[PDB]
Write an enzyme that holds these catalytic residues in place. Structure first.
Site, PDB file in Angstrom:
ATOM      1  N   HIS B  59       0.840  -1.190   0.000  1.00 39.94           N
ATOM      2  CA  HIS B  59       0.000   0.000   0.000  1.00 39.94           C
ATOM      3  C   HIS B  59       0.879   1.246   0.000  1.00 39.94           C
ATOM      4  O   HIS B  59       0.469   2.312  -0.457  1.00 39.94           O
ATOM      5  CB  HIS B  59      -0.912   0.014   1.233  1.00 39.94           C
ATOM      6  CG  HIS B  59      -1.437   1.371   1.576  1.00 39.94           C
ATOM      7  ND1 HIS B  59      -0.714   2.281   2.319  1.00 39.94           N
ATOM      8  CD2 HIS B  59      -2.590   1.996   1.237  1.00 39.94           C
ATOM      9  CE1 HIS B  59      -1.395   3.410   2.420  1.00 39.94           C
ATOM     10  NE2 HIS B  59      -2.537   3.263   1.771  1.00 39.94           N
ATOM     11  N   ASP B  83      -0.490  -7.726   0.995  1.00 42.56           N
ATOM     12  CA  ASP B  83      -0.085  -6.334   1.159  1.00 42.56           C
ATOM     13  C   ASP B  83       1.402  -6.232   1.498  1.00 42.56           C
ATOM     14  O   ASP B  83       1.808  -5.343   2.238  1.00 42.56           O
ATOM     15  CB  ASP B  83      -0.936  -5.662   2.253  1.00 42.56           C
ATOM     16  CG  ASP B  83      -0.982  -4.157   2.117  1.00 42.56           C
ATOM     17  OD1 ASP B  83      -0.588  -3.662   1.048  1.00 42.56           O
ATOM     18  OD2 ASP B  83      -1.423  -3.464   3.061  1.00 42.56           O
ATOM     19  N   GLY B 139       1.715   6.809   9.192  1.00 38.22           N
ATOM     20  CA  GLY B 139       3.126   6.797   8.874  1.00 38.22           C
ATOM     21  C   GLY B 139       3.837   5.601   9.463  1.00 38.22           C
ATOM     22  O   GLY B 139       4.997   5.388   9.158  1.00 38.22           O
ATOM     23  N   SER B 141       2.841   2.279   9.030  1.00 40.61           N
ATOM     24  CA  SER B 141       2.574   1.032   8.302  1.00 40.61           C
ATOM     25  C   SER B 141       3.908   0.436   7.891  1.00 40.61           C
ATOM     26  O   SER B 141       4.762   1.135   7.354  1.00 40.61           O
ATOM     27  CB  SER B 141       1.763   1.297   7.038  1.00 40.61           C
ATOM     28  OG  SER B 141       0.546   1.798   7.536  1.00 40.61           O
TER      29      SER B 141
HETATM   30  C1  LIG Z   1      -0.112   2.738   6.716  1.00 37.28           C
HETATM   31  O1  LIG Z   1      -0.201   2.171   5.386  1.00 37.28           O
HETATM   32  C2  LIG Z   1      -1.504   3.107   7.254  1.00 37.28           C
HETATM   33  C3  LIG Z   1      -1.536   3.454   8.756  1.00 37.28           C
HETATM   34  C4  LIG Z   1      -2.946   3.631   9.328  1.00 37.28           C
HETATM   35  C5  LIG Z   1      -3.090   4.647  10.398  1.00 37.28           C
HETATM   36  N1  LIG Z   1      -2.504   2.089   6.945  1.00 37.28           N
HETATM   37  C6  LIG Z   1      -3.522   2.307   6.118  1.00 37.28           C
HETATM   38  O2  LIG Z   1      -3.715   3.383   5.544  1.00 37.28           O
HETATM   39  C7  LIG Z   1      -4.473   1.144   5.924  1.00 37.28           C
HETATM   40  C8  LIG Z   1      -4.554   0.758   4.460  1.00 37.28           C
HETATM   41  C9  LIG Z   1      -5.946   0.330   4.402  1.00 37.28           C
HETATM   42  C10 LIG Z   1      -6.731   1.385   5.087  1.00 37.28           C
HETATM   43  N2  LIG Z   1      -5.823   1.609   6.219  1.00 37.28           N
HETATM   44  C11 LIG Z   1      -6.175   1.939   7.460  1.00 37.28           C
HETATM   45  O3  LIG Z   1      -5.418   1.798   8.415  1.00 37.28           O
HETATM   46  C12 LIG Z   1      -7.594   2.427   7.677  1.00 37.28           C
HETATM   47  C13 LIG Z   1      -7.496   3.780   8.383  1.00 37.28           C
HETATM   48  C14 LIG Z   1      -8.872   4.384   8.636  1.00 37.28           C
HETATM   49  C15 LIG Z   1      -8.791   5.718   9.348  1.00 37.28           C
HETATM   50  C16 LIG Z   1      -7.946   6.702   8.548  1.00 37.28           C
HETATM   51  C17 LIG Z   1      -6.568   6.131   8.216  1.00 37.28           C
HETATM   52  C18 LIG Z   1      -6.692   4.778   7.546  1.00 37.28           C
HETATM   53  N3  LIG Z   1      -8.347   1.472   8.466  1.00 37.28           N
HETATM   54  C19 LIG Z   1      -9.316   0.756   7.922  1.00 37.28           C
HETATM   55  O4  LIG Z   1      -9.562   0.779   6.717  1.00 37.28           O
HETATM   56  C20 LIG Z   1     -10.151  -0.084   8.880  1.00 37.28           C
HETATM   57  C21 LIG Z   1     -10.638  -1.342   8.171  1.00 37.28           C
HETATM   58  C22 LIG Z   1      -9.620  -2.424   8.106  1.00 37.28           C
HETATM   59  C23 LIG Z   1      -9.399  -3.243   9.205  1.00 37.28           C
HETATM   60  C24 LIG Z   1      -8.440  -4.243   9.159  1.00 37.28           C
HETATM   61  C25 LIG Z   1      -7.680  -4.412   8.010  1.00 37.28           C
HETATM   62  C26 LIG Z   1      -7.873  -3.601   6.897  1.00 37.28           C
HETATM   63  C27 LIG Z   1      -8.849  -2.605   6.964  1.00 37.28           C
HETATM   64  O5  LIG Z   1      -7.063  -3.832   5.759  1.00 37.28           O
HETATM   65  C28 LIG Z   1      -7.336  -2.945   4.693  1.00 37.28           C
HETATM   66  C29 LIG Z   1      -6.405  -1.800   5.003  1.00 37.28           C
HETATM   67  O6  LIG Z   1      -6.717  -0.770   4.134  1.00 37.28           O
HETATM   68  C30 LIG Z   1       0.714   4.030   6.752  1.00 37.28           C
HETATM   69  O7  LIG Z   1       1.354   4.457   7.716  1.00 37.28           O
HETATM   70  N4  LIG Z   1       0.668   4.665   5.593  1.00 37.28           N
HETATM   71  C31 LIG Z   1       1.507   5.803   5.282  1.00 37.28           C
HETATM   72  C32 LIG Z   1       0.846   7.073   5.745  1.00 37.28           C
HETATM   73  O8  LIG Z   1      -0.187   7.059   6.414  1.00 37.28           O
HETATM   74  N5  LIG Z   1       1.479   8.185   5.402  1.00 37.28           N
HETATM   75  C33 LIG Z   1       0.996   9.509   5.722  1.00 37.28           C
HETATM   76  C34 LIG Z   1       1.712  10.426   4.740  1.00 37.28           C
HETATM   77  O9  LIG Z   1       2.881  10.195   4.403  1.00 37.28           O
HETATM   78  N6  LIG Z   1       1.027  11.481   4.270  1.00 37.28           N
HETATM   79  C35 LIG Z   1      -0.300  11.700   4.628  1.00 37.28           C
HETATM   80  C36 LIG Z   1       1.679  12.369   3.407  1.00 37.28           C
HETATM   81  C37 LIG Z   1       1.442  10.080   7.050  1.00 37.28           C
HETATM   82  C38 LIG Z   1       0.528  10.761   7.828  1.00 37.28           C
HETATM   83  C39 LIG Z   1       0.912  11.353   9.012  1.00 37.28           C
HETATM   84  C40 LIG Z   1       2.235  11.265   9.432  1.00 37.28           C
HETATM   85  C41 LIG Z   1       3.155  10.581   8.664  1.00 37.28           C
HETATM   86  C42 LIG Z   1       2.756   9.993   7.481  1.00 37.28           C
END
Ligand SMILES: *[C@@](=O)([C]([C][C][C])[N]C(=O)[C]1[C][C]2[C]N1C(=O)[C]([C]1[C][C][C][C][C]1)[N]C(=O)[C][C]C1=[C][C]=[C]C(=[C]1)O[C][C]O2)C(=O)[N][C]C(=O)[N][C](C(=O)N([C])[C])C1=[C][C]=[C][C]=[C]1
Ligand SMILES: [Zn+2]
Lengths: 22, 183
Positions: B59, B83, B139, B141
């Site tokens: 992802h 994933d 951030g 994941s």
């Molecule tokens: C991770 O990839 C990230 C961390 C989550 C806090 N994970 C996700 O985005 C996953 C991929 C998905 C959907 N999610 C979720 O965690 C979502 C969640 C809902 C609330 C809003 C945030 C996302 N949760 C669900 O969908 C619940 C349903 C569910 C339950 C169990 C299993 C699954 C779903 O599997 C499907 C998962 O689908 C991460 O850290 N990503 C990088 C990131 O977030 N970066 C940002 C960033 O760089 N920018 C925004 C620029 C970041 C933000 C803040 C600080 C630093 C970086």
């Protein structure tokens, strides 16, 4: 598409240490 | 490492340096640690080294190459469904070893170097003993879920939140890593 870049590290292998005075 | 789990974070590249490196695909910086904070041009997450392989979420990394001192590096494994994506561990990193004790008391290490307790509740689910706002887990994941002895149990995947607070976390158990490698 751009490569994934390492921009920092989290280190788990560190143990408590007396911060050297310097 | 081992006894009580403690961690620290160190930034190694800035915004402009990261962008240039992302494009050139050649990173000359020194690598250390078990968890690497990584970024694309769109987002930043974590990648954890387990048994010589740097793993992270598809992802986040999608199917991209990892910038290295020898140019970009092609992934060794890719598993859209699980994933997952993995590249050879960078020279300099230290790897974690899978958990061999079936502990249900996990510890999630976030990008801020905080280790928060998580109670295993289902192979790929665990509940946060201390709910945190979702913004706190963003951030992280690709980060590790550790057993009290510091062995990798899983890689943080998703937050189970409501009204903006995360009560639980979904993670990719190490067993899927082995499966992805075998598949
Ligand atoms: C991770 O990839 C990230 C961390 C989550 C806090 N994970 C996700 O985005 C996953 C991929 C998905 C959907 N999610 C979720 O965690 C979502 C969640 C809902 C609330 C809003 C945030 C996302 N949760 C669900 O969908 C619940 C349903 C569910 C339950 C169990 C299993 C699954 C779903 O599997 C499907 C998962 O689908 C991460 O850290 N990503 C990088 C990131 O977030 N970066 C940002 C960033 O760089 N920018 C925004 C620029 C970041 C933000 C803040 C600080 C630093 C970086
Ligand atoms: Zn263990």
């Amino acid at each position: 598409k751009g490569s994934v870049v390492i921009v920092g590290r989290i280190v788990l292998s560190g143990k408590p240490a007396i911060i050297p005075k310097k | 490492m081992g006894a009580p789990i403690t961690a620290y974070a160190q930034q190694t590249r800035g915004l402009l340096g990261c962008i240039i490196t992302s494009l050139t695909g050649r990173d000359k910086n020194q690598v250390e640690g078990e968890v690497q904070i990584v970024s694309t041009a769109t987002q930043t997450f974590l990648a954890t080294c387990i048994n010589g392989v740097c793993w992270t979420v598809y992802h986040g990394a999608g199917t991209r190459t990892i910038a290295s001192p020898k140019g970009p590096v092609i992934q060794m494994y890719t598993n859209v469904d699980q994933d997952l994506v993995g590249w050879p561990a960078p020279q300099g990193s230290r790897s974690l070893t899978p958990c061999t004790c079936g502990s249900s008391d996990l510890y999630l290490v976030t990008r801020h170097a905080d280790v928060i307790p998580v109670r295993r509740r289902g192979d790929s689910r665990g509940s946060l003993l201390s709910p945190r706002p979702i913004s706190y887990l963003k951030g992280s994941s690709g980060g590790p879920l550790l057993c009290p002895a510091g062995h990798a149990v899983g890689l943080f995947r998703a937050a189970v939140c409501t009204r903006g607070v995360a009560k639980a976390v979904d993670f990719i158990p190490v067993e899927n890593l082995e499966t992805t490698m075998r598949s």
